[PDB]
């Protein structure tokens, strides 16, 4: 009976987003709004998962900032980021890169996919 649910799940949908995968380094232009002035913060990191369906898609980005592993999960269609920049490609063999939580440094690096 969700026949008409997708009709409502086709207006809030985004189209600017590219087609990335888990293991692909990206650069999200989050839109921070500190009261009056709103800058555009840049979050660069790996894409360790991408889960959900339709309007509920969420992807996770991971980076190591001053020796701390930060993670930010965004809805793929959230009107919060200006644009998503697919920087490189990954040569992973999984769909949930959860094994990168404990790996640090040289071991915890995703390899480019040289075509």
């Amino acid at each position: 009976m969700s026949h008409v649910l997708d009709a409502v799940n086709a207006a809030s949908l985004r189209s600017d987003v590219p087609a990335f995968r888990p293991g692909d380094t990206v650069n999200v232009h989050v839109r921070v709004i500190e009261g009056n002035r709103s800058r555009i913060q840049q979050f660069k990191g790996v894409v360790i998962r991408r889960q959900g369906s339709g309007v509920s898609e969420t992807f996770t980005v991971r980076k190591v900032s001053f020796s701390v592993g930060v993670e930010r999960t965004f809805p793929v269609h959230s009107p919060i980021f200006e644009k998503i920049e697919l920087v490189t490609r990954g040569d992973v063999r999984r769909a949930k890169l959860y094994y990168l939580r404990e790996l640090r440094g040289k071991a915890a690096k995703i390899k480019e996919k040289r075509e």
Binding site: V32, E34, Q41, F43, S65, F66, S67, V68, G69, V70, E71, R72, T73, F74, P75, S78, I80, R101
Partner: protein
Amino acid sequence: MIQQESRLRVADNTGAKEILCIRVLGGSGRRYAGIGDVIVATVKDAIPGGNVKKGDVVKAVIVRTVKERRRQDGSYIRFDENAAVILKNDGDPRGTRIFGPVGRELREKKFMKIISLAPEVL
């Protein structure tokens, strides 16, 4: 979520390294504290010669958590370790330098000095 008997890394240079959470302030029976919540902790490990000595009872603000926290815009943030900054009684940090990133939740809670000193606010 950080509760009683939880241990936090100190993210500033007051001389403390590890603090044990004694209590969560802001309510009777309060259970969990996140980013921006003030707690009372005891210094369990400290740098020799530092200002705060092991065994001191201090108030600290939590600046990082491992449990992902939701934001209004629908996005979430999480870190790899739980960290706090020791405060003075007047709400100002005891240390002068802050290590690692901190969450943006501090801005609404008026920990502006913490933020000004933080290398990066995510």
